[PDB]
Each structure stands twice: as C-alpha cells, then as structure tokens.
Design a protein around this ligand. Structure first.
Ligand SMILES: [Mg+2]
Lengths: 108, 114, 46, 36, 97
RNA sequence: GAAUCUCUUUGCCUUUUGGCUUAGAUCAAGUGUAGUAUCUGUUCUUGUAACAACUGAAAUGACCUAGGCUC
RNA sequence: GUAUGUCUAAAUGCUCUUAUUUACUAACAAAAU
RNA sequence: UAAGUGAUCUAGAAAG
C-alpha cells in the first residue's frame, strides 16, 4: 500500500486475499490520513502563494474552496460520517457567505 | 487496500504500452500463464463413479478442477473444454468434456455416469 | 446458494452459451441449406 | 465432529495490555451516598 | 483475477518484477521456467540459481513419491520424472567453471 | 488345606454418540448480483613463392624455502 | 466476499493481430400479470 | 368594497 505525498493511499499491485486481509487499515488510520491530506491542501495552498505561483486573493479563494469542499476534496466522511455534519455546516456557511458577498456583484 | 479499490498506484514513469510490451516479452519466459490446465472451482453435474476405487461422487459436489481447452472445437466457433477432477478417496484423475450439441457433457476416461 | 456451475462460462447448460451454440448452428445450418440446394440442382442437371 | 459442547470455562491472569478501551474511560467519578 | 495466480501474473506485478530485475538484480528463479539447453547462460550466478531450483524440484519429487498408496501409477511416473530431474542437475554441474 | 492357570456368569463396561439456531436452510433457478483480470503469430544473426622470427603447448605429481629451476 | 494449507539447505531486438473472454470469483440474493 | 406572502427530509465508506 503506497502513500502518495498527497496522502491518498492506494495499492501497488492487486492484492491477493491474504495480503488484503493483513492490510485492511481501519477507521483510525484512514481518518488520520484524511486529516493529513487536508493539512497538506491548506499548507500546499499557502506554499503556492509564497511561491510566485498564485495571487493573495487567489490563495484566499483556494483556502475557502478547500474548507467548503473538504467533503469532495478528500474522504474524511467515508471513514467517520459525523464529519458529514461539519460538511453540511460548511456548505450552509458558503450559501450564506456567498449570498452576502455576491449581492450587487454577480455569480462567479 | 480494499476490494473495491478504484485506482492502483503506478510508478511515476509507467509508459503503459511499453509496460505491456515488457510483460509480453517476459510472458514466454514466465512459468504460470505459459501453461495448460489452469485451475477452476466446479460442482459435478454428471454424478458419477470414480473408475479406480468406485467412490460415488454425487451431483453438485464441489471440486477444485483444472479446465483445459480442447483444440478440436465443436463445429467451428464454439469451444469445448476438459474439466479435470480428483476422486475424494483415491487420487485418480477423472475428467469430462462439454460437447454443446446435446446441451450437456461427455465423460473422458475418468468415470462413468449413473 | 445451490448449483455453482450455473455461474461459469464453460458450463454449456448456462443459457448464454446455449444461445451462442444455437446461433452458430443456425448460421452454419443456413449455409448448408444454401449449398445443399445448389448441390441438389447440380445433381438434377447431371 | 468438532462442533462440540464443553466442560469448563477459564480465568488466568497475564500482564495487562495498556489499551485505551472506550467504556473504561472515566465517567461518574462522584459516588453517591445514603443519608445516615 | 480470482485465485491468486492471475494476480501474480497481472501486468502490474510483471512490470514491477521487470523493474526489480533491471535495478538491483532481483530475479525470482522460481517464477521463470528453467531453460532446457544449458550453455545459453554465460553468467555463473544465474546458472547456480537454476541448479538450486532443480535441486529443490528434485527434493519435492522425492518427498511425495514415498506416499502410502505406492501401487498407484503417478508414483511410477514420478520415478522417471525424478530420474530426469537428476539428469538435469548433473548437466547443470558442467565443467566450464 | 495352600500356590497357580483355563473357561463360564454377575457386577464394572462407549447393550454405541461432547453444543445452539427458522427440523439451521434447501433438494429448486434463461438466473440475477457484485467484484477481479489481459491476448494472436512471423522472423534477424583469395591462392602460390621468397625473405625476417620461433621449434612447441597444457596438466597435475616428484626437489628446495605462495615463489624458484629440472623431469 | 475472490478461501485455504503443506513444500524452500546458505539469446537479441523485430513487428504484426483486434467491432471479444481458454477469462476468473461465487462467500451474496432469489418473484410475477 | 376583500383572492394569489411565506414552512423544502435527505446526502457515503469498510468489512461481512
Ligand atoms: Mg461470516
């Protein structure tokens, strides 16, 4: 089971059944991995910003996207499905915030 | 790590075509894949007697057989197979063929149907 | 479950295989008929 | 067969594991009492 | 690719094996069939490995042929197989080095 | 009377059994359903003469303390 | 839910074939108008 | 002479 540096774990070969049995990590480890991935994503965005790659505004937007899209961006919810509540809350915030923020200004 | 795994990890340099070619090159050398009598799990439809030790293996009894392709097909473009079995008691190689003209099987120097 | 063989390709009693066989026969049979008639005609001529 | 009934249970003491069981977690530290 | 063999000979695994062979020199002489005609093997290590494999095979053959149903024909057949294996082993002990 | 051995009967003996569940379920089925995996052959691989030079290699063993000559 | 167990001394490149699969797994589930 | 305002559940992963 090889770890990407983005924390998305997945298998090298197709595992024989014994191997699979041995190597089913559970709800702890996966959760941890997810958390790490999230961290990387926020940290990655800041790194990008620091590097000339992306504007401050862009960085901010990226961060916002990450925080709202945790749900899509990376499976935490899979492993612990009360993160679903958090996701929902984030979505709600986005809905509220976006409507406040894009009043006279248009969709984008 | 989980049977429904979407994407298997590949190295950062994995020219898929090239990889395939390489595999092919190392398939003639390979032990398994370059052989006949590839394994299979099957229940026995015929319900027959093992000719050596007379062990009455009944219908639907499960075995780890060997399926092999018979080169001489039925008619033209519909294959037929030899399906090896062992008797439980004595280790005599029973087998049978699947001639699809009658929608049924044929015994092949293993046992007799009854 | 019961009869395993029913979930195998090689099993001829599987319906798909049977269908395939029928198709093969049907095509081949048709061809034979086409040729058979011709043969008959030839014989008649002779 | 080995599908088998039984004769007796057990109770043998080893070195403790030091595992953080969920139920074992603290809860109701305060014991109540009677009036007298 | 049920029953493990398929998995083993799945393309990815093969590729991995090839890579290993290329870099570091991990071969599995179990995995490939031993060649028929010796003297198409200039390296010594490879030859040694082959010899080892054949020895192992011979041992395996030996282990099974003393089974209790001695009158069965499989055992008899193996006796010839055993002989063949022995011959192969002998051949592998060629005198080039 | 005492020692022992052989047979029969009674007692003692596996005059027969180490779980539970919907008797565990079923003696039926164009199955459906989910998953997991890649293949066919055909081929590439100058002579003759004269002059200058050497007459001989390899194996292991016989001597001396890996090395040195002889057979 | 893709079972399992024993067993182990320390030729080179080449290309051509595809509108497919000798494909394998059945632990899973089983009805009519 | 007076209709027609608003109430909006959800939400996937493993093993079996
Ligand atoms: Mg279970």
């Amino acid at each position: 089971l090889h770890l990407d540096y983005n924390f998305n774990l997945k298998p090298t070969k197709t595992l024989t059944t014994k191997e699979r049995k041995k190597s089913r990590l559970g709800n702890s480890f996966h959760l941890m991995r997810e958390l790490l991935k999230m961290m990387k994503l926020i940290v990655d965005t800041h790194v990008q910003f620091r590097l000339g790659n992306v504007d401050a505004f862009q960085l901010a937007d990226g961060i916002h996207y990450i925080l709202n899209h945790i749900g899509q961006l990376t499976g935490i919810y899979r492993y612990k499905y009360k993160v679903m509540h958090q996701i929902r809350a984030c979505k709600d915030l986005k809905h509220i915030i976006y409507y406040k923020f894009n009043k006279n200004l248009g969709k984008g | 790590s989980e049977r429904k795994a979407i994407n298997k990890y590949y190295p950062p340099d994995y020219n898929p075509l090239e990889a395939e070619k390489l595999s092919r090159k190392m398939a003639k050398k390979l032990k398994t894949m370059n052989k006949s009598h590839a394994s299979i799990r099957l229940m026995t439809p015929f319900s027959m007697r093992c000719l050596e030790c007379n062990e009455y293996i009944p219908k639907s009894r499960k075995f780890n057989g060997k399926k092999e392709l018979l080169k001489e097909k039925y008619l033209d473009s519909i294959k037929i197979y030899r399906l090896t079995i062992s008797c439980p008691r004595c280790a005599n190689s029973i087998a049978f063929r699947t001639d699809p003209g009658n929608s049924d099987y044929v015994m092949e120097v293993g046992g007799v149907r009854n | 479950s019961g009869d395993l063989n029913l979930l195998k390709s090689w099993n001829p009693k599987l319906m798909k295989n049977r269908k395939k066989v029928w198709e093969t026969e049907q095509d081949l049979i048709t061809e034979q008929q086409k040729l058979n008639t011709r043969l008959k005609e030839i014989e008649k001529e002779r | 067969p080995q599908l088998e009934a039984r004769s007796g249970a057990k109770a043998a003491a080893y070195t403790p594991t030091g595992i953080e069981h969920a139920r074992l977690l603290p809860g109701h530290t305060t014991l109540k009492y009677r009036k007298f | 690719m049920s029953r493990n063999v398929d998995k083993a000979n799945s393309v990815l695994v093969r590729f991995q094996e090839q890579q290993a062979e290329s870099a570091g020199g991990y071969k599995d002489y179990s995995r490939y069939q031993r060649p028929r005609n010796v003297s198409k093997v200039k390296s010594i290590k490879e030859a040694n490995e082959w010899k080892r494999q054949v020895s192992k095979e011979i041992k395996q053959k030996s282990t099974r042929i003393y089974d209790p149903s001695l009158n069965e024909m499989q055992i008899a057949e193996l006796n010839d197989e055993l002989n063949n294996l022995f011959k192969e082993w002998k051949r592998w002990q060629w005198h080039i080095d």
